[PDB]
Amino acid sequence: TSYTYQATPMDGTLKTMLERWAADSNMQLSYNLPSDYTLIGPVSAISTTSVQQAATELSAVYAAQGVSVSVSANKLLVQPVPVS
């Protein structure tokens, strides 16, 4: 096999990969960062049928850059990490 969330040869950047995941899922992408970013090596570990798992793995990859990736309704949401 079934569809899996992963990086593929088509995807060069964080935003563009997520545009594909969103299109593949009938979801909105809200990309709330000032710049796109290249995909870094650790993204190559992601391969899962679960959008929650995939988004969360991706979030962890970009956490040290200050980024959160999450599933919010029909949206993939990329934003600065909200903290109290």
Residue numbers in the entry: 51 to 134
Would you copy out the relevant sentences from the publication that reported this structure?
In well-characterized T4SSs, VirB7 is a lipoprotein attached to the periplasmic side of the outer membrane. In order to understand the unique structural features of Xanthomonad VirB7, we have solved the solution nuclear magnetic resonance (NMR) and X-ray crystal structures of XAC2622, which we now call VirB7XAC2622, and studied its interaction with VirB9. VirB7XAC2622 presents all of the characteristics of VirB7: predicted signal peptide and lipobox sequences followed by a short and extended region that contains the VirB9 binding site. However, unlike other VirB7 proteins, VirB7XAC2622 has an extra domain whose topology is strikingly similar to that of N0 domains found in proteins from different multi-subunit complexes involved in transport across the bacterial outer membrane.
To better characterize the globular domain, we cloned and purified a recombinant fragment encompassing residues 51–134 (VirB7XAC2622_51–134) which was submitted to crystallization trials that resulted in large plates which belong to space group C2221 and diffracted up to 1.0 Å. Molecular replacement was performed using the solution structure of the VirB7XAC2622 globular domain as the search model. There was clear electron density for all residues, with the exception of the first amino acid (threonine 51) and residues 122 and 123 in the loop between β4 and β5. As expected, the crystal structure is very similar to the NMR ensemble, displaying an average root mean square deviation (RMSD) for the backbone heavy atoms and all heavy atoms of 1.05±0.05 Å and 1.61±0.06 Å for residues 53–130, and excellent agreement with the backbone 1H-15N RDCs [Q factor of 0.187 (regular secondary structures only) and 0.272 (all residues)]. The globular domain is composed of two α-helices sandwiched between a mixed three stranded β-sheet on one side and an antiparallel two-stranded β-sheet plus a short 310 helix on the other. The VirB7XAC2622 globular domain has no significant sequence similarity to proteins of known structure. In addition to the canonical VirB7-like N-terminal region, VirB7XAC2622 has a C-terminal region that includes a globular domain (residues 52–133). This globular domain does not interact with VirB9XAC2620_154–255 but does interact with an extended region (residues 42–49) that immediately precedes the globular domain in another VirB7XAC2622 molecule, leading to the formation of homo-oligomers. As expected, no cross-links were observed when the experiment was performed using VirB7XAC2622_51–134 which lacks the disordered N-terminal region.
